[PDB]
Amino acid sequence: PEIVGPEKVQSPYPIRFEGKVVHGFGRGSKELGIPTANISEDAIQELLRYRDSGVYFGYAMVQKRVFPMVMSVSAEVHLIERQGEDFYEEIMRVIVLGYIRPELNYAGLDKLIEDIHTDIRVALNSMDRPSYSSYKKDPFFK
């Protein structure tokens, strides 16, 4: 599907949390134009308590700037941006707005990378709606 999630953001969404980025933003995903941050197990256990594993979407803030994102749930955040920004800080705020799909069986490196680009396209489409886009200015990102 080209789009996912109901018209409005409602329970279980949104899910707000702040966590530390462990192991920095790797050069590999950076070379692919997908800044990636792995969130520390702590700070997400309670906020993600009853959520199924898989790929989620929403917004994330780093270095005082907000970007749309997709996150694999452990939590791996892939920021969506096309300018090759310099990400290095260790604290990130994330707001999960909806679910995209469950995890898929591993089928190689390129398939993994292509699924991420697809998830990103779908996330962008899914957040085009007013109930979703307003969270870019959420007080949590103050």
CATH number at residue 120: 2.40.30.30
Distance CA 105, CA 128 (A): 29
Tokens linked to 29: 């995903």
User: What are the backbone dihedrals phi and psi of residue 28, each rounded to the nearest 5 degrees, phi first?
Assistant: -65, -60
Q: Confirm or deny that 118 is annotated as ligand binding.
A: no
* Full domain range(s) for residue 93: 1-142
Nearest alpha-carbon partner for 58 in 109, 134, 142, 2: 134
> Measured in Å, how far apart are the chain's first and last C-alpha atoms?
33
Classify residue 50 as exposed, middle or buried by CB count within 10 Å of its CB (0-12, 13-18, 19+). exposed
| Residue 92, token pair as written in the block | 């990130």
Q: Determine which one of 7, 46, 76, 103 is catalytic.
A: 76
**Catalytic site residue 7?**
no
| Cα–Cα distance, 115 to 112 (Å, whole number) | 5
How far apart are the C-alpha atoms of 58 and 67, rounded to whole Å?
Answer: 9
| Count of domains forming the chain | 1
The dihedrals phi and psi of 114, each to the nearest 5 degrees, come to -65, -35
Q: Which two tokens stand for residue 131?
A: 């109930």
CA nearest neighbour of 79 among 22, 25, 6, 118: 25
Contact 60, 131 (CB under 8 A): no
Q: How far apart (Å, rounded) are the C-alpha atoms in residues 83 and 125?
A: 19
Method: X-ray
- 105, with CB counted inside 10 A (0-12, 13-18, 19+), is exposed
Take residue 122 and report the two structure tokens written for it: 């779908």
